[PDB]
């Protein structure tokens, strides 16, 4: 069984970061060389692993998380980061073992006049735990008066749109991100490089 990485990296559509997609990879043979020999990535940064050694390693599970953010937010997809994305949308743990891979997707995800489909969460009562996902769309209570789910004074819709346009500067352009988590439990390791 070959691990289905192509389904993740080459997906036609990507998730909004607040509703990031997760694909569990298990019990398969992974050829990571299609990733580490590729010249298509703007970021390929690993934690706890050397990417060129990946075809020699075995893990219990691999998770592939994917979403779109803007280019100047990719730096928040790292252990120890703060900010709207790290705090309210997608959080990595301090002891992360995995790789963060991103590429400029201006040609796919931007639209003349704006692509409003990609959203992020701007308000939240507390920070996400690592790998927590919040897809709720409850009106956020910024004041002492309950909102009752009605937007208005001190009561905010918690998501905003990126509105990507192709003429935006590169830090504001959309980037597709895939986070690979390499999980070794005290258990059999069934995601392996080729033998």
């Amino acid at each position, epitope marked *: 069984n070959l691990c289905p990485f192509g389904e993740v990296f080459n997906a036609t559509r990507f998730a909004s970061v607040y509703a990031w997609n997760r694909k569990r990879i298990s019990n398969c043979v992974a050829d990571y060389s299609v990733l580490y020999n590729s010249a298509s990535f703007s970021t390929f940064k690993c934690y706890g692993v050397s990417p060129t050694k990946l075809n020699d390693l075995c893990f219990t599970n691999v998770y592939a998380d994917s979403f779109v953010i803007r280019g100047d937010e990719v730096r928040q997809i790292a252990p120890g980061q703060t900010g709207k994305i790290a705090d309210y949308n997608y959080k990595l743990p301090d002891d992360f073992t995995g790789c963060v891979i991103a590429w400029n997707s201006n040609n796919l995800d931007s639209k003349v*006049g*704006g692509n*409003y489909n990609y*959203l992020y969460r701007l308000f939240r009562k507390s920070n996400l735990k690592p790998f927590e996902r919040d897809i709720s*769309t*409850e*009106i956020y209570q910024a004041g002492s008066t309950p909102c009752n*789910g*009605v*937007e*208005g*004074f001190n*009561c*905010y*819709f918690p*998501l*905003q*749109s*990126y*509105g990507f346009q192709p003429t935006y500067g590169v830090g504001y352009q959309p980037y597709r991100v895939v986070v690979l988590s390499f999980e070794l439990l005290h258990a059999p390791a069934t995601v392996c490089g080729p033998k």
Partner: nanobody
Amino acid sequence: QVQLQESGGGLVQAGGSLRLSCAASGRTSSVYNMAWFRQTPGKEREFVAAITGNGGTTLYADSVKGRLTISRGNAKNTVSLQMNVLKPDDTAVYYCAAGGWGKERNYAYWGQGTQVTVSS
């Protein structure tokens, strides 16, 4: 899936009054702030007006104050925009937006827009 649908556009004569409408569809337990933006070909889309969930607070672009009125419609997440004394340069695609406040184009939900063409 929350979607917005505008109606009421078309070809109108200068001086005339026109009402546009927007309705949200999809399962939701929220009542949104709703807004109207407009876009002329070759130009950036621009804020026109917004109204809060309960209809009690409105926000207008300075250029349209006194000529345009925004109001909530009959269902929870519906909004109306009446434009009076239409001018040729009111010609635009008019978009409904929902979820947010203010004049920037970062509201959560957006319609595909309705064309208004003013003749003289």
